[PDB]
Design an enzyme around this catalytic site. Sequence first.
Site, mmCIF file in Angstrom:
data_model
loop_
_atom_site.group_PDB
_atom_site.id
_atom_site.type_symbol
_atom_site.label_atom_id
_atom_site.label_comp_id
_atom_site.label_asym_id
_atom_site.label_seq_id
_atom_site.Cartn_x
_atom_site.Cartn_y
_atom_site.Cartn_z
ATOM 1 N N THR A 107 0.871 -1.163 0.000
ATOM 2 C CA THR A 107 0.000 0.000 0.000
ATOM 3 C C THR A 107 0.922 1.231 0.000
ATOM 4 O O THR A 107 2.026 1.190 0.543
ATOM 5 C CB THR A 107 -0.895 -0.009 1.258
ATOM 6 O OG1 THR A 107 -2.080 0.749 1.012
ATOM 7 C CG2 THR A 107 -0.165 0.579 2.435
ATOM 8 N N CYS A 108 0.487 2.321 -0.616
ATOM 9 C CA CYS A 108 1.320 3.524 -0.663
ATOM 10 C C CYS A 108 0.502 4.787 -0.364
ATOM 11 O O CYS A 108 -0.578 4.983 -0.921
ATOM 12 C CB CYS A 108 1.978 3.639 -2.043
ATOM 13 S SG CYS A 108 3.510 4.592 -2.072
#
Length: 214
Positions: free
Chosen positions: A192-193
């Site tokens: 996830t970013c």
Amino acid sequence: EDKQERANYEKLQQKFQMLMSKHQAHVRPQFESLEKINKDIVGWIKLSGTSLNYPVLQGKTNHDYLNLDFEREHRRKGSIFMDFRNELKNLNHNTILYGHHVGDNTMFDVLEDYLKQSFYEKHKIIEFDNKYGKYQLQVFSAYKTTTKDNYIRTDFENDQDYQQFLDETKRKSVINSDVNVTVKDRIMTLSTCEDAYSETTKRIVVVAKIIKVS
């Protein structure tokens, strides 16, 4: 406007599947088509029955497609992208993809569902394809992390090191998997970013065993 945004990926998803049916077994023609839209499209990642079904980008850096969709237009949710350090054709020990998680139920929002064992059981396999062949992602670990250094490693000094990584990766998992991974296997890490400088520091990581099914 989020309307057209969804429409664009909708057109592209319908196009990919028609190509996947038009060229079938052959992935080379499928991606030479996608690359006409943008040369940075190096792959496609899909999980049946969910919103995860997008093209994978790769620019020169890891902030290149942070806020850019696949036709290179600014978007808050940007797009799913591979670590600028990963090679195609000859995969590294660990390939990494990134994507946003805003709760809109898009991009990498589904990674959070992998924290629940029930969900994992019903979605053990993830599809990944590119110009060099078709792949299958066998999920064997899912977890939350505050760090952002170790889990983003591409290759290793020796088997022992890679061995430790796998061990650690397995111990961190919040889900139980029957998948048997060894230092001989290649893995893919879906991370996830957060938005640029968001620095919320809190990521969802899903790790899988990469299997060439072509």
